[PDB]
C-alpha cells in the first residue's frame, strides 16, 4: 500500500518564545533552510506520498511558504494537502482530527514538523508491518530512536527518555522523560534491556489505530502522554537506527546542536551544498573545512573562515 504521513507543522509547546511570536518555529531557517523543508524532504526521501500538513499557529506564513516551496509543485511525488484549522491546541487535537475525516487508511509516519533526519523508514516500516499482520493489531506504533550516547550535544537533557525494551522483540515496556531526575524508577511489573542511549527523534510510524486511540480516550494531548498512558493498559514497539541521523529541534539549544550537525554533513543527503530544496538562492560550494560560500559572497581581505562556515 502507499505510505502516508502526518506532519504536525505547529509545535504546541511555547518553546521558542519570543522567536515564535514573529515567525513560526517551523519556518525559521536552520542553515539557510526552514525546518519544514528538512522534514518534508525527509518524507520524500522515505518514499512518502500524501504528507498531510497540519497548521494552527500562524498558518498564513506556513501555507504561503509551502505553496512557493518544492513540494507543492506537481512534479513532486509527495502531495501535501495542507490542513488549516485553529481548533488544534495540541497533537491530540491533530490526531483526533485525523478521525472524522479518515485521512489515513494504512500505517503512516507521524513526524512532528521540525524533525531533521536522513532516516530510511523501509526497514522499520517492513518490520512494523511484519509484526502487525502477524499478531493481529497487537502493535500500534513503532517509535524510531537513534542509537546515541547520553553525553551528546544533540541530547538536550530535556528529553533524554529512558526505555525498558524486550531485546528479543524490540517491544517498548517502559518509557519516561528524565527531565529532572537522578535515579530512574522502573516498576517490577515488566518482568528485558534498559536503554538510555536513545535519542528520541520523534519519527513514530503509528498505525491508524493510534488515531482511533486518541479519539475514544479524549484525555490525551501528546505522544508522550499516549505512550505513557497505553503502557499502563496496544503494544508500542520500536526500531533503533545507528547509521542515520535523526533529531528534532524542540528548543534553541538542540537547534544549535542540529544546525552544527547539518553543517558538518552528519545528515549527508541534506548538506547545505546539496541544495535539497531546489531554490536558486541557496546554492553552495563545500570548500575545504565545511566552509560553504554561496553565490556572489565577496569575502573580504585577510578574513579567515576557519571551519564549519555557511
Amino acid at each position: 500500500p502507499p505510505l502516508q504521513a502526518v506532519l504536525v507543522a505547529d509545535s504546541f509547546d511555547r518553546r521558542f518564545f519570543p522567536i515564535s511570536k514573529d515567525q513560526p518555529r517551523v519556518l525559521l531557517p536552520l542553515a539557510n533552510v526552514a525546518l519544514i523543508d528538512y522534514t518534508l524532504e525527509f518524507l520524500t526521501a522515505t518514499g512518502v506520498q500524501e504528507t498531510f500538513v497540519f497548521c494552527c499557529w500562524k498558518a498564513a506564513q506556513i501555507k504561503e511558504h509551502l505553496l512557493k516551496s518544492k513540494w507543492c509543485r506537481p512534479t513532486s511525488l509527495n502531495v501535501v494537502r495542507i490542513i488549516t484549522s485553529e481548533l488544534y491546541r495540541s497533537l491530540g487535537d491533530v490526531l483526533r482530527d485525523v478521525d472524522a475525516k479518515a485521512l489515513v487508511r494504512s500505517d503512516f509516519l507521524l513526524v512532528y514538523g521540525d524533525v531533521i533526519s536522513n532516516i530510511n523508514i523501509t526497514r522499520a516500516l517492513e518490520e512494523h508491518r511484519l509484526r502487525r499482520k502477524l499478531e493481529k493489531n497487537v502493535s500500534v506504533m513503532t517509535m524510531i530512536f537513534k542509537e546515541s550516547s547520553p553525553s551528546h550535544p544533540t541530547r538536550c537533557h530535556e528529553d533524554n527518555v529512558v526505555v525498558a525494551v524486550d531485546s528479543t522483540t524490540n517491544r517498548v515496556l517502559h518509557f519516561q522523560k528524565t527531565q529532572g531526575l537522578r535515579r530512574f524508577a522502573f516498576p517490577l511489573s515488566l518482568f528485558v534491556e534498559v536503554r538510555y542511549d536513545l535519542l528520541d527523534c520523534h519519527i513514530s510510524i503509528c498505525s491508524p489505530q493510534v488515531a482511533q486511540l486518541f479519539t475514544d480516550n479524549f484525555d490525551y494531548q501528546t505522544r508522550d502522554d499516549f505512550v505513557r498512558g497505553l503502557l499502563v493498559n496496544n503494544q508500542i514497539h520500536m526500531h533503533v537506527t545507528a547509521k542515520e541521523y535523526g533529531a528534532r529541534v524542540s528548543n534553541l539549544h538542540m537547534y544549535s546542536a542540529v544546525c552544527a550537525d547539518v553543517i558538518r554533513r552528519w545528515v549527508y543527503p541534506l548538506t547545505p551544498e546539496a541544495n535539497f530544496t531546489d531554490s536558486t538562492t541557496q546554492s553552495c560550494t563545500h570548500s575545504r573545512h565545511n566552509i560553504y560560500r554561496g553565490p556572489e559572497v565577496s569575502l573580504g581581505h585577510g578574513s579567515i573562515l576557519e571551519e564549519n562556515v555557511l
Binding site: 570548500s287 565577496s298 569575502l299 581581505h301
Partner: protein, 287 residues
C-alpha cells in the same frame, strides 16, 4: 627591405603589450601587401626579422605565417588572386591570435585556488593576464616573482601587477629553492614550445621547474599557439645560439630548455594541453 625593420620597431613602439611574434606577423603582413618568388621574399623577411630580435617566438610566429598562407597556395594557384586570398587569410590568422591571451586566461585562472600563492618567473604578458583574469573572478592569492637578472624583468612585472592589488614579492633570483615550498603552483610564460612539449623561457625557468618537481609543485606554462616551434632539444646545448644570445668572463644565455617531464600542463590558445599533446598539435600545424 630596410623599412621592414623600421616598421617592426614601430609596431614595438606604439604597442608594447602586443607580443613580439604578433609584431612580426603585422609587419610581415604589410610586406605581403607590397607567384612563388613572393614566398622567397617572405622567407627573407623571416631572416631579417629574426636577425634583429632573435627570440624563439619571432622565428616561430613568423614561420607559421609562412605556412598558414602557403597552405592556401596548396588549394589553388594564381598571380594576384592568390595574393588577395593570402591577405584575407592572413588577416583572419592575425585577428585569431589577438584573442589568444583572453582564451589562455579563461582556461588558466580556474586552476588557481582561492588563497593560493603562485610563483612566477620574469615577466609575461600572459601570466599577467592569467592573474588579471583570476582577480576579476574574485580569487585572492599571493604572487612570488623572481627579479630574473640581467634585465630585472621581475621588478617590471611586480610593478605591473601591484596595480591589481595583489600581494606580490620580488624574490631574489637565487632564492627559488628557498621560497619553493611557499608556492602552491608555478605559472611561467613560454617564449617557445618545442616539439616534445617542453618550453624555452628566460634563463632560470629550468631550475624553477627542477625545484618544482623536487617538491611536486605543479608547474603550469601559459604559452600561445604561435609559439609552437619545431625544435627538439635534448639538453641545453641543443638550443640554438640564435635564441640563447641576444648579442672572469661572463656567459649569459638568455633562454634555457625545460624538459617536458617537469611541466604539469600547458595552457595554450588551443586548449589545455598535456605536454605530450603539444607534439600532436605541432604535427597538425605542419602536416
Amino acid at each position: 627591405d630596410k623599412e621592414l625593420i623600421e616598421y617592426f620597431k614601430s609596431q614595438m613602439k606604439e604597442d608594447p603589450d602586443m607580443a613580439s611574434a604578433v609584431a612580426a606577423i603585422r609587419t610581415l603582413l604589410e610586406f605581403l601587401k607590397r607567384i612563388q618568388g613572393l614566398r622567397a621574399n617572405l622567407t627573407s623577411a623571416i631572416e631579417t626579422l629574426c636577425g634583429v630580435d632573435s627570440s624563439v617566438a619571432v622565428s616561430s610566429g613568423g614561420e607559421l605565417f609562412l605556412r598558414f598562407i602557403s597552405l592556401a597556395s596548396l588549394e589553388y594557384s594564381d598571380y594576384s588572386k592568390c595574393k588577395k586570398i593570402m591577405i584575407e587569410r592572413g588577416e583572419l590568422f592575425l585577428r585569431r591570435i589577438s584573442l589568444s591571451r583572453n582564451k589562455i586566461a579563461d582556461l588558466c585562472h580556474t586552476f588557481i585556488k582561492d588563497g593560493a600563492t603562485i610563483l612566477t618567473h620574469a615577466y609575461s604578458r600572459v601570466v599577467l593576464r592569467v592573474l588579471e583574469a583570476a582577480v576579476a573572478a574574485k580569487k585572492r592569492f599571493s604572487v612570488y616573482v623572481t627579479e630574473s637578472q640581467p634585465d630585472l624583468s621581475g621588478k617590471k612585472m611586480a610593478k605591473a601587477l601591484c596595480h591589481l592589488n595583489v600581494p606580490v614579492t620580488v624574490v631574489l633570483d637565487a632564492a627559488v629553492g628557498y621560497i619553493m615550498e611557499k608556492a602552491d603552483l608555478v605559472i611561467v610564460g613560454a617564449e617557445g614550445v618545442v616539439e616534445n612539449g617542453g618550453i624555452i623561457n628566460k634563463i632560470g625557468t629550468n631550475q624553477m621547474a627542477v625545484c618544482a618537481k623536487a617538491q611536486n609543485k605543479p608547474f603550469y606554462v601559459v604559452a600561445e599557439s604561435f609559439k609552437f616551434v619545431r625544435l627538439f632539444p635534448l639538453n641545453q646545448q641543443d638550443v640554438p645560439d640564435k635564441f640563447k644570445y641576444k648579442a672572469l668572463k661572463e656567459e649569459h644565455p638568455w633562454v634555457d630548455y625545460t624538459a617536458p617531464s617537469l611541466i604539469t600542463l600547458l595552457f595554450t590558445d588551443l586548449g589545455v594541453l598535456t605536454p605530450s599533446a603539444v607534439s600532436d598539435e605541432l604535427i597538425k600545424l605542419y602536416l
